[PDB]
């Protein structure tokens, strides 16, 4: 992620997400193309519970996406970070589910 050990998953379909209010739903519809469609992570063998994996997958993926987006001149607000937190969490979850069923 700038220092080693993370791997990049295949791209996943962006989910329909409902955020519980009109303004965030509209915001989401308009801004969702700006958020990742793939996750960075560390091998599944290296975590105790899916909970950690997910937590880690999320901060690292988002932080790296933030460096590549920022270099390009545009910035994420706190709302961006919040939403990104949720959707990257679901995607990391699908990723854990997928990598662990390696049997």
Which residue ranges make up each domain of the chain?
1-103
Cα torsion through 66, 1, 13, 83, rounded to 10: -40
Q: Which residues contact 81 (CB under 8 A, 6 or more apart)?
A: 62
To what resolution in angstroms was this structure determined?
2.6
CB 71 within 8 A of CB 64: no
What tokens appear for 90 in the block?
A: 């679901």
Residue 8, strand partner residues: 40
Q: What technique determined this structure?
A: X-ray
Residue ranges of E strands in 19-103: 40-41
């Amino acid at each position: 992620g700038g220092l080693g050990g993370y791997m990049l998953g295949s791209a996943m379909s962006r989910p329909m997400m409902h955020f519980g209010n009109d303004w965030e739903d509209r915001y989401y519809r308009e801004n969702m193309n700006r958020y990742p469609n793939q996750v960075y992570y560390r091998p599944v063998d290296q975590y105790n519970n899916q909970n950690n994996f997910v937590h880690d997958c999320v901060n690292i993926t988002i932080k790296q996406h933030t460096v590549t987006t920022t270099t390009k001149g545009e910035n994420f607000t706190e709302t961006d970070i919040k939403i990104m937190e949720r959707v990257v969490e679901q995607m990391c979850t699908t990723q854990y589910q997928k990598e662990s069923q390696a049997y």
